[PDB]
């Protein structure tokens, strides 16, 4: 069987709503939706949000209000749901839906991001680490696991549209791109790069300067599976027609 899951960091959810959101659900339509930075408390959300017909909805939620929290949509409820690595400084931030779809794991993340400080930057290191060891032990017990959302990172050169000035900015330092590797290099693949070879294809623009428009951008936002259930993706792309945050969705779709 086909199953088409999306991925969006959607900026504040409340925002996104009222850009039209619910008729590009409603259009698109896919059997899971997984979304990043709601940033809204979800028991203030509209209810037309918490309560979308032939999806069950999944709210985690941040500590701050404002600030943060995932959230999942899935016509089909999963198994058991995961908010945590077990490590309470990552958890407690709602970044984290790891939910349990019997045939595989789905990895809801939104990842930290290391700007203006180095302590921010050490967290997201740290943060990083707890999840590759997390991820690791599930495929190990011979799990197969799809990691998406927001990565806060562009892997290589190809992954934004100024590599050169952007070196010694955070999305783009070597460290984070180290980790990248590390990551893949561990058994995991970055889904869309089966399929697309171009440069230019970007998940992310910066608001500030109608970035997008010109398609000056980042690439942050991917779809990881273990190489082991690679075979079994069938198509990875970017939904970048789709308006209404300062991310666009991307997109998984697989086979039983
Ligand atoms: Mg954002």
């Keep these: 069987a086909v199953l088409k899951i999306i991925s969006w960091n959607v ?60 959230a999942m949509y899935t016509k089909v409820p999963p198994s058991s749901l995961r908010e945590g690595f077990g490590v309470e400084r990552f958890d407690t931030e709602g970044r984290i839906q790891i939910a349990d779809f019997d045939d595989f794991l789905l990895y809801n993340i939104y990842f930290p991001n290391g700007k203006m400080s180095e302590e921010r930057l050490k967290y997201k290191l ?33 992954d934004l549209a100024r590599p050169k000035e952007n070196s010694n900015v955070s999305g783009f330092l070597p460290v984070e791109r180290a980790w990248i590797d590390k990551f893949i290099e561990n058994g995991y693949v970055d889904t869309f790069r089966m399929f697309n070879s171009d440069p230019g294809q970007y998940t992310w623009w910066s608001y500030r300067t109608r970035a997008r428009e010109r398609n000056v951008g980042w690439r942050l936002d991917y779809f990881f599976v ?31």
């Excluded at 273990?226 to 945050?245: A, Q």
């Design 126 to 158: 740290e943060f990083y680490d707890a999840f590759l060891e997390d991820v690791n032990r599930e495929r190990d017990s011979g799990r197969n696991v799809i990691i998406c959302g927001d990565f806060n990172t562009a892997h290589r050169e190809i």
């Design 226 to 256: 273990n190489e082991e259930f690679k075979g079994k993706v069938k198509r990875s792309w970017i939904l970048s027609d789709v308006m209404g945050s300062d991310h666009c969705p991307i997109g998984l779709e697989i086979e039983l």
């Design 11 to 70: 900026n504040g959810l409340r925002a996104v709503h009222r850009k039209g959101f619910l008729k590009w659900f409603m259009e698109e339509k896919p059997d899971i939706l997984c979304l990043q930075e709601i940033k809204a408390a979800p028991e203030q959300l509209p209810r037309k949000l918490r309560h979308v017909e032939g999806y069950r909805s999944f709210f985690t939620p941040a500590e701050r209000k404002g600030y943060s929290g995932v």
